[PDB]
Design a protein around this ligand. Structure first.
Ligand code: IPE
Ligand code: SF4
Length: 309
């Protein structure tokens, strides 16, 4: 059995920065350090941080007075940011710069009383934080997930309309939704394409190339990781068996029995050590040396705030 490794895969610049923010805060101020929601959607990463002294909570209420709080990489609504500022809490924002960029555009549209439409998945923290940057009752902030949602959306003034998107969506599906928005609201304005980040675009492109070579694709990443799910979904749509797994232990023999070529990739929040262990498991299951595919070079790095260096 041949083992192929997608490239790029794993940690993106935003994730690496968010994790370093928590680690450095812990090294500078010692434990405990409170973090609102998982800093990134990866069970292993979160566990490792708890070991170092981090405490993940869901609501600011859970955070004691005088404690250090860190916002997750997915970002937060203005309400949350205010709720933390109205408290005696020291805050460090690990929101990825690429998410913040979308945040700004929303707040901007909100100040100009112009309605905005976000393409994203309801309930995801990034969606909650981005929708949460709009607060002008004279305009509006609407969420759409598919062309169908677009087909039934009604706006106050489509003459002044703009759209934004979640950073981890399916490049293909988003394209379909944007096409619908333009046919519905011909005057709508937005980015040249979308707000899907380079890491998301690159990992989908890479898993596509992997899928055309492997019969089975294993995607390392947690169930709640939006970008990771998009990778498995893409593989599955190409007709290949694809599984989203947190670690080597989830691998079931039947998935790779008599399989000549298995591909492995990882979401933007999955550490390389998890991929290494998956490769080791595949090797005892008959796999040979893992062969890395040729791929897009990524060179962007996001530094932690100077205050935490
Ligand atoms: C911080 C963002 C947006 C993405 C990176 O990883 P994640 O796995 O942590 O979270 P999602 O893809 O679910 O957004
Ligand atoms: S996946 Fe994209 S937007 Fe989300 S943390 Fe990584 S680089 Fe930032």
């Amino acid at each position: 059995m041949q083992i192929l490794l997608a490239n790029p895969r794993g940690f993106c610049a935003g994730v690496d920065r968010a994790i370093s923010i928590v680690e450095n805060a812990l090294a500078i101020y010692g434990a405990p350090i409170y973090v609102r929601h998982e800093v990134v959607h990866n069970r292993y990463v979160v566990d490792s941080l708890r070991e170092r002294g981090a405490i993940f909570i869901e609501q600011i209420s859970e955070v004691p007075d005088g404690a250090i709080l860190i916002f997750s990489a997915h970002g937060v609504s203005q309400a949350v940011r205010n709720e933390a500022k109205s408290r005696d809490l020291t805050v460090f924002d690990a929101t990825c710069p690429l998410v913040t960029k979308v945040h700004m555009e929303v707040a901007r549209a909100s100040r100009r009383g112009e309605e905005s439409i976000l393409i994203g998945h309801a309930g995801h923290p990034e969606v909650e934080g981005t929708m949460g940057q709009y607060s002008n009752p004279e305009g509006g902030m609407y969420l759409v997930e598919s062309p169908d949602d677009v087909w039934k959306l009604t706006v106050k003034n489509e003459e002044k309309l703009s759209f934004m998107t979640q950073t981890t969506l399916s490049v293909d599906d988003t394209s379909d939704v944007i096409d619908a928005l333009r046919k519905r609201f011909p005057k709508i304005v937005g980015p040249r394409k979308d707000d899907i980040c380079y890491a998301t675009t690159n990992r989908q492109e890479a898993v596509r190339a992997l899928a055309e070579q492997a019969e089975v694709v294993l995607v390392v990443g947690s169930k709640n990781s939006s970008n990771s799910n998009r990778l498995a979904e893409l593989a599955q749509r190409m007709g290949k068996r694809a599984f989203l797994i947190d670690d080597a232990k989830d691998i079931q023999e039947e998935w790779v029995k008599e399989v000549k070529c298995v591909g492995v990739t990882a979401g933007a929040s999955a550490p390389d050590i998890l991929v290494q262990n998956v490769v080791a498991r595949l090797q005892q299951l008959g796999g040979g040396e893992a062969i890395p595919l040729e791929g897009r070079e990524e060179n962007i790095v996001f530094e932690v705030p100077k205050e935490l260096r």
